Write a protein that binds this ligand. Sequence first.
Ligand SMILES: *CC(=O)[C@H](CCCNC(=N)N)NC(=O)CN
Ligand SMILES: *CC(=O)[C@H](CCCNC(=N)N)NC(=O)CN
Ligand SMILES: *CC(=O)[C@H](CCCNC(=N)N)NC(=O)CN
Ligand SMILES: *CC(=O)[C@H](CCCNC(=N)N)NC(=O)CN
Ligand SMILES: *CC(=O)[C@H](CCCNC(=N)N)NC(=O)CN
Ligand SMILES: [K+]
Ligand SMILES: [K+]
Ligand SMILES: [K+]
Ligand SMILES: [K+]
Ligand SMILES: [K+]
Ligand SMILES: [K+]
Ligand SMILES: [K+]
Ligand SMILES: [K+]
Ligand SMILES: [K+]
Ligand SMILES: [K+]
Lengths: 372, 368, 373, 373, 373
Amino acid sequence: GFVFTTVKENPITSVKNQNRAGTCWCYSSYSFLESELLRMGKGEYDLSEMFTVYNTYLDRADAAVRTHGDVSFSQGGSFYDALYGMETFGLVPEEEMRPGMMYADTLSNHTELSALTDAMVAAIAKGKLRKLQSDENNAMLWKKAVAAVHQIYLGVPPEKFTYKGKEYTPKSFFESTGLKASDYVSLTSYTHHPFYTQFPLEIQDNWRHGMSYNLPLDEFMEVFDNAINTGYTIAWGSDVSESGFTRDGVAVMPDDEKVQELSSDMAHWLKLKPEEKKLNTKPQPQKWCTQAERQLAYDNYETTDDHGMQIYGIAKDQEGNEYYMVKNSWGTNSKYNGIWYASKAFVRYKTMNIVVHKDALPKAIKAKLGIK
Amino acid sequence: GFVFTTVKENPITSVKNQNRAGTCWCYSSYSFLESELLRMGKGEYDLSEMFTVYNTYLDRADAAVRTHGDVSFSQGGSFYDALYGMETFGLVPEEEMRPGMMYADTLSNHTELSALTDAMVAAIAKGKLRKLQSDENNAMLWKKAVAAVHQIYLGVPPEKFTYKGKEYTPKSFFESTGLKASDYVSLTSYTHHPFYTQFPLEIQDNWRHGMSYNLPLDEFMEVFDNAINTGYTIAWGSDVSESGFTRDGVAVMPDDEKVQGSDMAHWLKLEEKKLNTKPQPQKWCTQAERQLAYDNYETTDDHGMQIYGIAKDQEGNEYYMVKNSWGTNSKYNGIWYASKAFVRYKTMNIVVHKDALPKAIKAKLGIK
Amino acid sequence: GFVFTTVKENPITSVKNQNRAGTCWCYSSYSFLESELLRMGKGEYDLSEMFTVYNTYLDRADAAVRTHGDVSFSQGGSFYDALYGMETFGLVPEEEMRPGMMYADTLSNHTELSALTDAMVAAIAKGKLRKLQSDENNAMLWKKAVAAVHQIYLGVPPEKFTYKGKEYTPKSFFESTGLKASDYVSLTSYTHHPFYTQFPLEIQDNWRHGMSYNLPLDEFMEVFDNAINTGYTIAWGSDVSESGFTRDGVAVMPDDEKVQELSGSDMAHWLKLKPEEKKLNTKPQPQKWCTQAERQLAYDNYETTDDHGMQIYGIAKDQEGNEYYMVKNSWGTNSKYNGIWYASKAFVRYKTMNIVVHKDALPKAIKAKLGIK
Amino acid sequence: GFVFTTVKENPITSVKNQNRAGTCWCYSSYSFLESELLRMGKGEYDLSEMFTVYNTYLDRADAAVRTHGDVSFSQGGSFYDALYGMETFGLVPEEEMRPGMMYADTLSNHTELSALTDAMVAAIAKGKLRKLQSDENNAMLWKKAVAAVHQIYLGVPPEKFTYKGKEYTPKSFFESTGLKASDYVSLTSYTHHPFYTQFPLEIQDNWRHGMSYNLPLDEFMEVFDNAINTGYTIAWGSDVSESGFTRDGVAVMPDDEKVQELSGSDMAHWLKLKPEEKKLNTKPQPQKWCTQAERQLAYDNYETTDDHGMQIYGIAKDQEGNEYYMVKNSWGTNSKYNGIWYASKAFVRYKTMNIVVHKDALPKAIKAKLGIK
Amino acid sequence: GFVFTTVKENPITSVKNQNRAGTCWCYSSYSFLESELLRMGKGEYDLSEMFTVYNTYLDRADAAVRTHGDVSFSQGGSFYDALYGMETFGLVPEEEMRPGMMYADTLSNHTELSALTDAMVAAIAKGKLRKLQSDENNAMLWKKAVAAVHQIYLGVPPEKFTYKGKEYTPKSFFESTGLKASDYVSLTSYTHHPFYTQFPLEIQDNWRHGMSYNLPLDEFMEVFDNAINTGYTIAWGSDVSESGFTRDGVAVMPDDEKVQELSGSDMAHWLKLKPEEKKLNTKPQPQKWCTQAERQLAYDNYETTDDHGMQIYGIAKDQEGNEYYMVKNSWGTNSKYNGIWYASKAFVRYKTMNIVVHKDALPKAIKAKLGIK
Ligand SMILES: *CC(=O)[C@H](CCCNC(=N)N)NC(=O)CN
Ligand SMILES: *CC(=O)[C@H](CCCNC(=N)N)NC(=O)CN
Ligand SMILES: *CC(=O)[C@H](CCCNC(=N)N)NC(=O)CN
Ligand SMILES: *CC(=O)[C@H](CCCNC(=N)N)NC(=O)CN
Ligand SMILES: *CC(=O)[C@H](CCCNC(=N)N)NC(=O)CN
Ligand SMILES: [K+]
Ligand SMILES: [K+]
Ligand SMILES: [K+]
Ligand SMILES: [K+]
Ligand SMILES: [K+]
Ligand SMILES: [K+]
Ligand SMILES: [K+]
Ligand SMILES: [K+]
Ligand SMILES: [K+]
Ligand SMILES: [K+]
């Protein structure tokens, strides 16, 4: 089995549960922003994902209609959706818009909401309508309909609310946190664009076309360690549709060839049970990908924008392999109570993009990117 | 051409315009009920079709979901939808829910509303959802969604309103009119059910399964003349997808063989035959010929109108005076002249007041 | 009828014919770039649209696959596709890749090419494949397949060629022209984004997400006249799906109410009248001058769409003094004005999606508000 | 368990692996033709299936387009595809076109190739195109596209190559083998056509409409034994979608009623016993010996379909004396008998679609009834 | 206009009317066979197309099911369907199974029949059924269903009937005519197969895969004249989806370029004329004479398809001396020439798919090249 030893970890809030909704982009973004508020001495917060999820879906519906269905309308999103959201829509506390409150639950189940809203947006964006209807103030009626249905399943967004004795608006509550979207940068590492430049990742949930700074793979991984070692956390967008990512709290990238030599020869090893191979159950030699191997997986669909999480610490196993400590959003009913251990080889290979505070960047990388 | 002379006509209200919506079932029903209020001495009314159209669509959406998509969800309806509606939802005046007020118009355009609501109802009724969501009061969330979207395109139904100095609710306003749904009967004429019995017509817009009394074709047509001659009007549901039904205010059933100076080989390769422009010999259908057209899709539940009078042409042919709901931009300002032969052949069903029925027919149907 | 008188127009090349392909974005871009070369004293050029169209489709196929089918794969494009293309792929003269040369024609017919490549891109982008195949050099095989099929219908791109005695590559030929993509800016006018900022237009053929500067409508229209009056031309991307845009060389925006008032007919007889008798698009009529909000509504409700790309190169007036922009289309010369269109300023104000001009065509005050040095 | 003893078997080449491609028709045909070359004293050969697979798919795409989609375009084929192929295209050694060489593999994976080419052929054969494009030499452009995509995934067919010191073309290399397609006949056994006549089997992969001689079922089975006993092998096209065809190297046709009686349990208790305790396909059991009508019903009601192509090369017996045919499969050697299957004579009698043998493998009397010299 | 003068014509029966059914293949085949019976001194016959149509559709449904939907199930057919039909099913006179008798008509309207049977065959051939049901005699139940529905719309086929005082069966009535399918050959002219060989045309309605002899185009046309001049008629399967094939009884192949050269207008004045003004199909014009390659291109690129079946029975000339073939159509007599068409020799040379003639209609030299006794 695995025996992990924490090397360094930074403060995080409690593990949340997105339940039956594709809102990991918002839950991980808020785990990140809440750790940012803790680091900035602002205290512990519990931000409402349903508020940002609600406003993001309305903008995504508008994008689908403007592009006549090219922008897909689904539940996913990005870290930039939350950074854009707090500046544009603001923030509200968790108590003002809880998950499941409209259908007598305490956890999200957006299957019916999507079934209706996907059908509505498609009837407009991909239909035969030549002129969409509007009221005397040139307000579109279909936007009212999509907003009305979203409010029925997610709740009504508060215009004013009281939090710890003071009255706020979503905008004024965001201002009280002191957060600035300009303090955060998105980073990635690919070769189909020149290094040290900005490009929008060609993924479906990046329909806002948010930019990311492009770094070489080795410098990309240094930002991870530099952020954790200097007290920062990382918003981690990664591929999790791999055999190494298990339900038992670990994400590893084992070298299948090296494990076969330490065992049975190559012929007998290839007919040993998965329980007998122990590829994802014990510390194994990791495969350290090159920049080209990382690019191939992104080109050939083996690395997709699957899941958003938060990296907040570094740990080691009994054999000395290094891991990143990951805060998931699937509740606490797992081996490590909602915490995952992702090996550095896995993160190097399957990371789509990350968001960190600017001051988490090493001085040399800041200069190469032109960030003051 | 045609030269029509009114033989008798009964009071009607102004010609309305359903415009770009399949809501003729409600517009013709209200033309009928407004003539009924005039006949009963209640004065002139302008009832809101959009109020009943709104509530009918919510019930039709529920019917589609309960039957998992068997009941089709579309814009059409029946005279019974209005009779059931006034008893269940009530009535409001036209001013309280006008057509097009939500998209800066004065006439209906429900194409976008249908595009949205058809997609929503289908996602529930014909989708893969195994458990529909509900709130703490067991109210369905999808019904809230479908109702909210209808209100955005049709308007909010009034809970209270003031009409001619008095405050009303939709229910109390209906009660002030004195209308009773039990005073009205639906009549049809087909042979796939026994005569003088009741059966629900097997048509898509009769999803409420309203009953109709079955009469022989000759006795069926006697109700038409007796109703007009005793001062009543008729809610007329008929097939209008015929070559004889023209946009120029006439509906005729000409005998193609009898009209044929051109030989048969020249006639079958000839608008030039002046078939719908002058008085022609009519095809007087038998009961079996009427039944075949209903069985083979040639007679379908197309359109709802109001018959309010009888007229003659220059040659003495009898016509029924029809009040359509397509506005007044036609040859007779929204009025149609339907020959008795056309009505005999293409009528789906009619609704009249009980007292418009002859006494002998009333007894055969068992109507007190 | 119409009688037009040129007020001022700037030099253009011959009218081209895109024929049966949705490549107006490239033909108008090159009509624009060729006028830029004439203005810069470089002479007359005939740049190959098929070269840029070929390389653009390979990038669009890649965009469709990376976004798993979100980016639609179709024939359209944008002015930025050509501006990006000349910097990335270069330029070749018309003779090196002519339209229709592969199927024994002289004009484009890309219907069969699209039928195949649309089916190919969809099989990859929207299929069930879990791992796309690659060779020993990590090159994707599907990109080789899509590139090979495009070459069979469009031709092989030249690596080297000789033009007027000198040997070139596509890159070195572009460098010999002196064109710079940084000299050109995209402009638009909408209110769903703040004025004097940059945003990518939310249209399907802008899959590269090229930015456009947002201007108020009146300052936006000032760029048109200042560009023409100072000797520049305009790459004009506009909606042409209007009743006022006719096949007879005019694009007008008539006020239906004012024309109805100045005729004996009333509202009832007019709404059931013969369009030949309304003379709405056949003689000078009072124009409908849209507000900023009316322009925004048409873009919001699908009445203003990214339909067609053309070139504005002059200003003209009719017999009544109404001003028009002179438009060079790419539908050949078999029209009333030999491939030239006259679009009234009211039509351009209402139906323009975006334009591309040289930076120096901007008035100095507008340059300052946009932060363009 | 099963214990097999060879009665007679004829020389075969090594077991191949078709991997993730529906190319069993070509791998079995080449196992058959290679045994023919050994029998004819020509030595051991390793013919390239990918060469014949490449050329066959181009002909199948042409057939699909000519019939506007009636001929399905899929990976399958028939023994006649290979016999026709060697006469028309020729033969090349394995080294000149290996499987997987284009996507850095050593075994075939044609899933992506099919995804593209199925989409391309359907866009032409089942689309709305009214006139397909052609070049100056009347060569169809879509055929160029389908060929180019196949070469990207399968490799370039060699025009010339050197094999064991001699230079060949695909045609001249085929001529050096001495093989003749006229030496081989297709045989089947059905009643919806008269016996001792020729008819093309009404199966999808027989889009070339190759003929088969129709024999009574008993005389059909006599050809099997006579071919093996006189030193010939058989190209065996058969249904393998049966419970009796197992992954453990056996293909049996057990009589469910007799096996139930042979166990102590009655009809009720037997029908609620687990399959491990049923032992239907794990030990020798009484076989179901079908009639001609029972064989016809299974072909008529979809229970016998053209699933798989293999090679029968020997006869074996089990511990109880039951006779089996020794089958060379093309799924590699990672099975109980290293890629070899044992198919009981009852299974072969029941589930055989058709066979191909050399003319001289036919008994003289059967050869006379068919009119074969 | 056209003024035609008959050069020679052979006896034919009355013009029939297929009405709303795709049964031209059977009506033209029986017009052909009836002229053969007149030529052989057997008298005039009126054979029932609905009898052969009924039995052909049952076989085509079986073909669709056996090929799991590859063979399309539609109303069309071929001349070989009737030649095969009379040998297999026999012949009955028109009176025993008339068109429309089942739905109170006198002419065919098979739209509803097709709607039902297309859905039935597709539910079997392209469905998910793994085992089709059969009765105690191994007869397929779906074949009973498809046959029952065909009888409801077409009528019950007679087992016995009385004709001119004698009682017949469908088989014995066919024998009384003396017709032999072996007396007739199918001919075509294409280059994707070797000349003077037999191949089945790759067309959807040739699902029986009937063979045709391949002739060079010039020798192919010699059979036309030799058959007519020696007293025979021709079963003519041709493409009729051309601008030259008009509803006014003519089928021409005018050279658009050559007519403009003899026209008074220039190239620019001609390409801007009204169709009625450019008199392409209304007056005798110079014809376009195709090469063998041009004929092949039209078959390859979908411009020549197996559209219509007719009968050629004579040769005629126009006022200017151009040669035409006299064609007996099956669209009734309500046309300019009462159901007769005049097809120029250039049209027949270009748009003919295949023909069927009696063996003795072939020239002696051509008969020898094909190896026909
Ligand atoms: C991690 C998560 O919950 C969402 C799931 C979205 C699923 N949507 C579709 N498959 N169409 N993932 C993301 O938001 C990734 N950015
Ligand atoms: C009254 C009216 O106009 C409708 C037309 C709409 C029909 N559309 C559909 N059924 N989908 N006709 C009726 O309501 C017939 N009673
Ligand atoms: C004007 C032109 O040729 C293209 C046509 C695009 C057609 N697109 C589709 N049929 N899906 N228009 C543009 O490129 C506009 N940017
Ligand atoms: C045995 C083999 O590899 C092929 C598989 C063809 C599968 N085809 C489709 N799923 N469409 N089988 C044959 O070639 C049978 N003759
Ligand atoms: C000439 C004729 O009647 C048929 C047309 C039927 C074809 N219809 C469809 N394929 N849907 N033509 C032929 O039979 C030519 N073989
Ligand atoms: K929270
Ligand atoms: K993955
Ligand atoms: K009203
Ligand atoms: K009708
Ligand atoms: K050019
Ligand atoms: K438009
Ligand atoms: K091999
Ligand atoms: K089977
Ligand atoms: K006949
Ligand atoms: K044609």
